[PDB]
Amino acid sequence: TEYKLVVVGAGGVGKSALTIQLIQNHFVDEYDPTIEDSYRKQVVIDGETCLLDILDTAGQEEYSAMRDQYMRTGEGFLCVFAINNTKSFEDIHHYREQIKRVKDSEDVPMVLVGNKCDLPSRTVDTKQAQDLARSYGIPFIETSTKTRQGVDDAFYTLVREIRKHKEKMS
Numbered sequence: 418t419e420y421k422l423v424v425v426g427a428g429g430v431g432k433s434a435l436t437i438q439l440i441q442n443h444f445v446d447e448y449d450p451t452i453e454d455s456y457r458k459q460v461v462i463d464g465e466t467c468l469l470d471i472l473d474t475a476g477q478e479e480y481s482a483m484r485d486q487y488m489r490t491g492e493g494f495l496c497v498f499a500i501n502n503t504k505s506f507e508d509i510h511h512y513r514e515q516i517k518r519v520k521d522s523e524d525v526p527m528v529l530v531g532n533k534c535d536l537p538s539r540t541v542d543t544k545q546a547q548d549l550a551r552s553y554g555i556p557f558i559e560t561s562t563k564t565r566q567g568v569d570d571a572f573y574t575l576v577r578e579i580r581k582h583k584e585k586m587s
């Protein structure tokens with residue numbers, strides 16, 4: 418019943434920072450006597466219990482066996498670039514294409530996220546990113562984990578995208 422969210426993008430764009438901040442504002446303890454400790458932590462977003470994973474392909478993950486498994490298991494993807502890192506924006510299309518290939522689907526819930534929007538050293542304009550998102554047919558939102566701008570909205574929007582997809586498949 419859980420929604421499986423995956424945060425994907427180039428190294429250093431802020432995927433961990435986004436995910437940590439989301440957990441901080443949304444985790445709760447749940448009573449569940451069927452498990453040994455009787456309580457588990459869970460994240461609830463827009464009324465849905467959500468699982469959270471980060472997909473990174475560089476650094477230590479250059480050595481990982483798990484990339485395609487992350488893509489197959491995830492139900493919706495936050496595709497993150499940083500607004501001060503043009504290469505990270507150029508890398509988005511590769512991630513999206515790989516996800517569509519691995520999932521063998523043209524309809525994969527996704528949201529495009531331009532993180533670090535607090536920074537004054539912008540090299541990716543809001544319009545370039547909006548054009549990309551429009552080509553994909555997905556929402557685009559700018560975020561900052563420093564000011565908190567957009568962070569909740571990015572994940573809430575992804576949850577709605579997944580919900581609408583699950584409604585259609587049903």
Ligand SMILES: Nc1nc2c(ncn2[C@@H]2O[C@H](COP(=O)(O)OP(=O)(O)O)[C@@H](O)[C@H]2O)c(=O)[nH]1
Nearest residue numbers: 428429430431432433434532533534561562563
């Ligand atoms: N200015 C700014 N820095 C950020 C933001 N989000 C993350 N960072 C910083 O960017 C660096 C990389 O973040 P991290 O979460 O490790 O990125 P990941 O490699 O994509 O998981 C760290 O120094 C973070 O503090 C943001 O919204 N604004």
